[PDB]
Amino acid sequence: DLKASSLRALKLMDLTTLNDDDTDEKVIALCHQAKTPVGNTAAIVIYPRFIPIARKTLKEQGTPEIRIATVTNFPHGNDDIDIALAETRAAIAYGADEVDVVFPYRALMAGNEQVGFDLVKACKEACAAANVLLKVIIETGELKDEALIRKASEISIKAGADFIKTSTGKVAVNATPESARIMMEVIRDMGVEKTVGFKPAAGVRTAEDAQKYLAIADELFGADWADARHYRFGASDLLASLLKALGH
């Protein structure tokens, strides 16, 4: 089953490079990696400044259907909506297909439930007006407590998140199977599985990991639920493991 799981995970991957030393050449190489011998990843994830050259690279290699995702309010998740919205508008103008925005998780931990709602909603409004999907990163490894993880997921969903995403990859603790279960249970309990996807990020490293995460989705929503609109692997390291499991 591991081989079948690995191809499924590959076709759901948000193949990521988000490094301080990123260059145009590193992003072009990433676009080439996204076109694998066994099929294409769902998307790439890059800083907003690399969207235009990534678009041309994906087009010229014959994979314009690989989506371009990016990050905003990132990685800090500050509570300044004007800044988060301006970055989101810039990402749209660069050409993003998808924006992964960081939820203001420290403000929620400090007792501000409203700002996360208002921030997600403002960014969702800009994205939806551009036919851009909005993922919300809640930073589970900083929230830590299950109740806060549920609360942040719930606020994000009510404010219009198209995906909820565990982590930035820029803190020590990122996706865990337990954090994934909690957030997917929020999707389940709210009844929003048709409109809200799930994205574990930065914690999924091996083909075995990816199978475990997809098993949670299959168990909660049925094996047909986890398609590209409802599940992605945010990963900068996993692709080589999945290709190894597939004999490539």
Q: Is 118 exposed, middle or buried (0-12, 13-18, 19+ CB in 10 A)?
A: middle
Q: What is the C-alpha to C-alpha distance for residues 142 and 140, in angstroms, rounded to an integer? A: 5
Which residues lie below 8 Å from residue 221, measured CB to CB, with a gap of 6+? 184, 187, 188, 193, 230
Give the active site residue among 79, 100, 162, 209: 100
- The encoded tokens of residue 150 equal 């549920």
Is residue 165 among the annotated active site residues?
yes
CA-based max dimension of the chain: 50
Give the active site residue among 124, 151, 199, 209: 199
- Residue of 245, 179, 192 lying closest to 221 (CA atoms): 192
Q: What is the C-alpha to C-alpha distance for residues 195 and 192, in angstroms, rounded to an integer? A: 6
- Number of domains composing the chain: 1
Four-CA torsion 101, 6, 205, 193, nearest 10 degrees: 30
- The resolution in angstroms reads 1.7
Domain boundaries, position 248: 1-248
Is residue 97 among the annotated active site residues?
no
Is residue 1 among the annotated active site residues?
no
Q: What is the C-alpha to C-alpha distance for residues 248 and 243, in angstroms, rounded to an integer? A: 5
